[PDB]
Amino acid sequence: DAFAALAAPENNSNPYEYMRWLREHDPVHRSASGIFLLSRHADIYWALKATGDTFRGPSAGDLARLFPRAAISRSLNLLASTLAMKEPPTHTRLRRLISRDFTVRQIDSLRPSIVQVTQTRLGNIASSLEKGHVVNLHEVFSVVLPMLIFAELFGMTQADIFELAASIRTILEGLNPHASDEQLAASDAASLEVERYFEGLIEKKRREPQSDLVSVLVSTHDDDDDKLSDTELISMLWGILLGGFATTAAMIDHAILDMLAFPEQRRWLEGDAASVKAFIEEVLRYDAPAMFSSIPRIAQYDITIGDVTIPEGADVRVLLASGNRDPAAFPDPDRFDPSRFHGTAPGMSTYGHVLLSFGHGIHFCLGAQLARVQLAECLPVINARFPHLVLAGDPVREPSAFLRTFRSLPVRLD
């Protein structure tokens, strides 16, 4: 069972050796649960692009058949009504309600806050590091920047997002096939607390609307529940919150760790916009924040791939991280090399193969530009501010079945 392999402590630090074995010996892998896992870049790309007809989100019947605990799991039923589980026209309706605030144009208008938050945070980080303290950069920068920026966009107070960060982490870990009974229970319970917060937040924004995404969603719902039902509203709030910062923080963590691990590639962070972006794309390819997606893709046909046949109705997952290191798509895949993404469109290598960390197709990440811009603003500043930064020991990873997140990124000045 590949999902238990990826969650095993042995493979927590570097799971790519197992992923390499999986691509070569079982690329269309059937787990013990009957869930399939695609590890080759070309198959992952096809599955993502084919979502719509060949693959769809689960119906009511699929949900009961594949997730028998669904009637009992608050987290699973909240997921079932997010737009990531839907196809057009429903998917098109939901996405258009939220896409404006994530466009290039609107993300640009956040750059002053990103700079301000970055400079304010670093000024305090510098003060502590010049005394010779050790700083958990994950805790005091990597999570803080996207939490604050997301809260501003979404309509949450900074106090709210910090109060809920622990609930978010707990919810996220229950969203994978290897989740233990305890993790699933804890996830459902935290989803309840998050849902109660949003009930309070909805009434506040109903009575006090601002230029934030939650206010737009609530007014849309209040005006016409066929544009956004009560079920779709609460799943959207819960879902966007889940996706709003945890993976961005992990990207920042990975970027800092790559900065310190490969001093030769650090020069890319000192160049023009294109050179900085190229570094960030290679961070995303080299170690995706989500190894695979919690989102099920249900086969609408028997799908024969080589000698393996995926039966109709089967849940299929995509190992984004493995496709990112597939030598058929990225030569010398274990080399960290920003030149792959220099001068090209975002996510596209100079040889025409895409990174997969943001997905592809109808469910391509809504927040990709928001994530990329935050790191493009702060990473060159970190690099210039602290040239003598080093690790003060091994980073402590958040043990996860599928997310590549950290509990600590301990640094100090040399």
Ligand X SMILES: C=C1C[C@@]23CC[C@H]4[C@@](C)(CCC[C@@]4(C)C(=O)O)[C@@H]2CC[C@@H]1C3
Residue with Cβ nearer ligand HEM (277 or 413) = 277
How far is it, in rounded angstroms, from Cα 157 to Cα 153? 10
Q: How many CB atoms lie within 10 A of CB 404?
A: 21
Q: Is residue 381 close enough to count as binding ligand HEM by CB under 6 A?
A: no
The one-letter code for the residue type at 71 is A
* 371 touches, from ligand HEM, ligand X, none (C-beta below 5 to 8 Å by class): ligand HEM
Using CB atoms within 10 A of its CB, is residue 232 exposed (0-12), middle (13-18) or buried (19+)?
buried
- Site residues for ligand X, 273-292, by CB under 6 A, read 290
Tokens representing 391?
A: 């690790």
Contact pick of 240, 314, 321, 375 for ligand X (by CB under 6 A)? 240
User: Where do the DSSP E strands lie in 214-323?
Assistant: 297-299, 303-305, 308-310, 315-318
What SS3 state is found at 65? helix
Omega into 89 within 30° of 0, i.e. cis? yes
Q: Is residue 298 close enough to count as binding ligand HEM by CB under 6 A?
A: no
Of the CA atoms within 13 Å of residue 126, those in its CB half-sphere come to 13
Q: Is residue 338 close enough to count as binding ligand HEM by CB under 6 A?
A: no
| Closest CB 331 distance from ligand HEM, rounded Å | 23
Residue with Cβ nearer ligand X (84 or 378) = 84
| Closest CB 413 distance from ligand HEM, rounded Å | 28
Q: Is residue 110 close enough to count as binding ligand HEM by CB under 6 A?
A: no
Task: Point out which span in 60-68, 169-177, 182-190, 239-247 binds ligand HEM (CB under 6 A).
Answer: 239-247
Contact pick of 174, 359, 380, 410 for ligand HEM (by CB under 6 A)? 359
Task: Point out which span in 15-23, 193-201, 362-370, 388-396 binds ligand HEM (CB under 6 A).
Answer: 362-370
| Closest CB 232 distance from ligand X, rounded Å | 11
Size of site (CB under 6 A) for ligand X: 14
Q: Are strands 315-318 and 36-38 parallel, antiparallel or unpaired?
A: parallel
Nearest partner of 353 among 373, 327, 375, judged by Cα:
327
Annotated binding site for heme b: 91, 95, 293, 297, 363, 365
